[PDB]
């Protein structure tokens, strides 16, 4: 039972009525535009209306490297290498300009963020603009790809080896040395994983959100 990440409010001091109304608008838009299920790593083709374009319709295919934002305005970033030039486009889920969203391939990676594909080799970010949609059998677990990419020589856009990012899909043993690994193992915070008060429940909130979604489906 998949709940979209934008359907979980961030911890704060906001009146739940605003979240309720935003969710109502989100569902009333979802009934018109079928937003599918996808994760960070799934291949998506997005077809959108656009002025000043060939046929006023623009289609972009790419891998989802980041999903961020809650409520109306949630965004996902698609990256693809076209003619040797990497292009990343940020698409809003509930923008009326979006005409169709299609999951060409549904899968998951070892990390919740794939921003290191910018510094990775172009082979791991190159995808065919015209690829046949794969078949995902119903009532099946989402596959978890374990492709550990190879990175370009340093420097990188961000210090991916530091524990704060906590990346498990990069060949650090190949792209780094023992001394570099030891130096990176200096910002580690072992107490962070054991700080109990820095945890968000999401259980009751998710249950109430599912109840409201079921009510919207009924009506």
């Amino acid at each position: 039972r998949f709940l979209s990440p934008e359907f979980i409010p961030r911890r704060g001091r906001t009146d739940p009525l605003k979240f309720q109304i935003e969710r109502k608008d989100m569902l009333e838009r979802r009934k018109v535009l079928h937003i599918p299920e996808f994760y960070v790593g799934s291949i998506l083709r997005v077809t959108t209306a656009d002025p000043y374009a060939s046929g006023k319709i623009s289609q972009f295919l790419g891998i989802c490297i980041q999903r961020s934002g809650r409520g109306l305005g949630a965004t996902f970033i698609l990256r693809n290498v076209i003619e040797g030039q990497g292009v990343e486009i940020c698409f809003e889920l509930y923008n009326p300009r979006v005409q169709e969203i299609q999951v060409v391939k549904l899968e998951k990676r070892l990390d919740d963020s794939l921003l290191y594909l910018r510094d990775a080799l172009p082979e791991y970010s190159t995808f065919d603009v015209n690829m046949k949609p794969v078949v995902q059998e119903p009532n099946q677990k989402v596959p978890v790809n374990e492709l550990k990419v190879k990175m370009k020589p340093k420097p990188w856009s961000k210090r991916w080896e530091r524990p704060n990012f906590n990346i498990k899909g990069i060949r650090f043993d190949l792209c780094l040395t023992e001394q570099q690994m030891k130096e990176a193992q200096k910002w580690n915070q072992p107490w962070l994983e054991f700080d109990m008060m820095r945890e968000y429940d999401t259980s009751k909130i998710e249950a109430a959100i599912w109840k409201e979604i079921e009510a919207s489906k009924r009506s």
Binding site: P51, T75, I82, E83, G86, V87, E88, C90, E92
Partner: protein, 115 residues
């Protein structure tokens, strides 16, 4: 995005660009009052020891939603009259330039890919 001392990459098939040189192309003027150049703006480049005008067709800085973000500061060499130096732009460029096509019609004509 693109400002003074910014090393840009020339993407059209011009003779002045796409040529070996010890130095790299570099912006020296952005022709904008705020001093920051975006997609669809004219800049001045010191390329091969010469001063030339260029149009910004892509930058690495994130911008508005539903817009492409490239991995390099891609520019196309043009002239004062508004005509490009090259005759082919294989690198994809944003479709947002079709609003400026009133002054970049020839550039968009020589362009081939629109992302």
């Amino acid at each position: 995005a693109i400002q003074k001392m910014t090393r840009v990459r020339v993407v059209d098939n011009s003779a002045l660009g796409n040529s070996p040189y010890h130095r790299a192309p570099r912006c020296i003027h952005v022709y904008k009052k705020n001093g920051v150049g975006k997609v669809g703006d004219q800049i001045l480049l010191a390329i091969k020891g010469q001063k030339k005008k260029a149009l910004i067709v892509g930058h690495c800085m994130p911008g508005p939603r539903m817009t492409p973000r490239f991995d390099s500061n891609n520019v196309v060499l043009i002239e004062d009259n508004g005509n490009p130096v090259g005759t082919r732009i294989k690198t994809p460029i944003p479709t947002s330039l079709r609003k400026r096509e009133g002054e970049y019609s020839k550039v968009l004509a020589i362009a081939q890919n629109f992302v």
